[model samples]
Target: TTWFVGADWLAEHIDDPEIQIIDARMASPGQEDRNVAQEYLNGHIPGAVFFDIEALSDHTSPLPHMLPRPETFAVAMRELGVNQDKHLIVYDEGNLFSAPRAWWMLRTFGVEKVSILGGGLAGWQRDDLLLEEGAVELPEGEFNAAFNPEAVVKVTDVLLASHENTAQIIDARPAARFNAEVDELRRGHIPGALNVPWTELVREGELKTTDELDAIFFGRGVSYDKPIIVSCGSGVTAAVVLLALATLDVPNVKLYDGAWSE
Candidate 1:
């Protein structure tokens, strides 16, 4: 089941105090030319807050999509109009992909009320919601991260999960990527991970129907009772799986920063 609100729902809640939309628009690493902030300035969903994934992560990391410290993200959220009470609804243009990483960050920070837009802005466009354009400048708020150490899994923790049969490791890379037929800058997975690409959770550019989403995870043999650590090319897209699992109330999901990239 998608933990989502539709475009119509978003339109209705655009001005609602309880709902906040986060735009996790990302530029390809080293694409210096692709400015996600400039695009947000050009046009974006009304009342949407911008969360630049590129800026939100650890810049010093040689690997891609590595999560930053909680304090770092806390500052980002405070500046972006996020707080403890807001019901966060995340989105992006491509699909409901990058938003999940942000959602995961929120979870890691102990913020519990987060979800993704089913079809993302694509669904908003399909429903024709008015889009706002021009530079966005919002007064920064007082949000700060209260880092919860338990929600994260560092390299050492991942090494432990590799040998711990009690833990379930999930890779969101394509089957080819997992099989090593496609060489990522970093090769091989944390032996024994099940391959379930983030794309499998959606259909026609939107989240799959509730039953389908449920069946997709269950059919993958996801162990609800065990802890699940989600990994992907760089560690970003796999959060899509994490978000889906969250929607189903499956606790104990962690993101692996070394996710096949480093």
Candidate 2:
């Protein structure tokens, strides 16, 4: 499903109890030390509850924001009032960023109605919608875990793809990091992986139109014919690219959860 929903559509459906708004905004790389949850405290869409992908990660793993267990995710979803009965709408602070990770997690766990908020919280404000401050509390929902493994990949799998040419691997990092102008877990990108910086995929946090994305992917020699594996410093921004590819209806796409940082 090409599940991108615009702000106007969400506004009309905002009052529906079957809709669950999730604020997936979190601190980016440079703002890693900041508490992004507080941003939700300042303001958010009405009825939107905060969900930090990093905080919901598998803490037992050293890698940043690894997916948690299915049971654990189900419990978290229940706490956040996210369930199959409700249409899940995930939004960032208007950048069209990290919400995809939340969407990926929810979709992986079998929530079929999950989608991203086009323009995000910023779009809501742009429409003159009301904002609620502080935290939100909702009744635990009936969300159950139905984990799907096909959307996820690992380092070994990626290495094999790189060596065997079985799949196309896309790095979602900035060109600086991909080109080694900025050192990360390593000085360079994954062997032979194409660099399609997340910046090129969006404008001011909103994903570019499908035609524009089609041009970017083709221009970079990224074809949809083969399975695609996406990665970044951590796994966060990679979902941004994953979302873009999904928008283009690319089949057989997966995220390298433990990216360069691994």
Candidate 3:
């Protein structure tokens, strides 16, 4: 399946029993405006259920939204009606923000068929498509999890890469945060890291063309041939870069789970 699904295409097949739609509009900490569940309750794509990004996480870890254990993830996916037989279509409210985290998580857990909604709900609304209010209930799904080892890195891996230069560490946080020019819960980025703000890979909530993304990454000194690690304030936005690079079929790329939080 393609890495992204167009809203028009999804709307055309909204009733297809083979596909499952997930609203992954994860709220930013302290940002009351980014509430996904309330928005889903108000209006969402027909038959779509809200995925609790925070709930499907490793709460024992201090880092924000770390991956849950494989069995835990399996149970959660089953509850969400995400089975091996169905294709997953994940979307955020309008920013193309949190959906990739869901996409990355599913892939890391060995879900083979998954795609993000290009332009997200914003694109859907722009096209004047139909939306459904309230909840969507479905029977339990039978999604099994087999975790992939190469999809993620830890803080030690990142720190080792910093000194050894084993991989090109790319910071996906905003430029201001990368440069320590803006105040954040944590300031500055890892040493020997290159900054490529994740939002640069998008236009109006949709990912940029491959050529455009190539230029952006190459211009920032990213190489397609080398192993690369992506990081952000937390692990969330970093997945945007991971997804973009995955689209380009870049090899040996992984996300740093602790990110700046650890």
Candidate 4:
């Protein structure tokens, strides 16, 4: 089984002690800021723990959603009752929005059994599954963090790439944002980065076909042979690109977790 699971499979294993379901719902910036945690409190999958993307980030850093150190991540995961042995199922509303980022981050931090809910909560709701409201608590888990530096890239790496031409940097934000037409925390993008809006790789709230994905990459001069670094406004949507690249079996792809906000 790959890192993507359907609602039926999750529902079947919902009661399994070895399985942990996580709700990673996030609201995009510039819209009416929503409280995803509150949304989870209102209604979510049974036994689902809320994973706040911002809360898990490096608070000391100036950038939004920068990856925290191993110790910090370990503490947060333990508080969420995440252990090393269990399988983690992560999902979000609105077409898999920030769920893949949670998947990417967990895998990067060396959690071997993490998966994403296919189509996210949307798929779960479509199946008419029951949703539980209010808070759920669990005992703290024992999770030891083993960080994988290869899975992530930093702003320094991107700057070095800008001068050295070592990696193929891809901006996953829309052209308007990438071009500075839209007001954002940061204007413009990393020099030499290509624009491939994350939405382009998705259709009707699902990932596009392999052929379509291939075209989207190749059309932008992205080669599977080169090292690819994905980035976005706040590092959330870039995971969609990482997921797409991984699906294509493209080796040497990494996520720039700070992205433009740095």
The best candidate in terms of lDDT: 3
- Using lDDT as the yardstick, the better of models 1 and 3 is 3
How many clashes in each candidate? 0, 1, 0, 0
The lDDT of model 4 is 0.81
Write the residue-wise lDDT of candidate 4 on 1-262 in tens digits. 1457888999999999989988998888755468778999999999998889878988886667778788888898888887766889888895766888888888888878888888788778889998999987888887887788888777788888776777888888877678764533235777788888888887644577889999998998788765899875645898998888888888778887764343
TM-score of each: 0.86, 0.92, 0.92, 0.91
> Model 3, stretches more than 4 Å misplaced?
181-187, 259-262
Q: What's the distance in Å from true for residue 227, model 1?
A: 2.5
Q: TM-score winner between 2 and 4, please give it.
A: 2
Whole-model lDDT values for every prediction: 0.73, 0.81, 0.82, 0.81
lDDT of 3 at 153: 82
Error of 4 at 162 (Å): 2.3
What C-alpha lDDT, on a 0 to 100 scale, does residue 52 get in candidate 3?
89
Worst 10 residues of 3 by lDDT: 179-188
For model 1, the superposed segments whose C-alpha errors exceed 4 Å read 27-33, 181-187, 259-262
Candidate 1 lDDT trough over 10 residues, lowest sum? 178-187
Model 4 vs. true fold: TM: 0.91
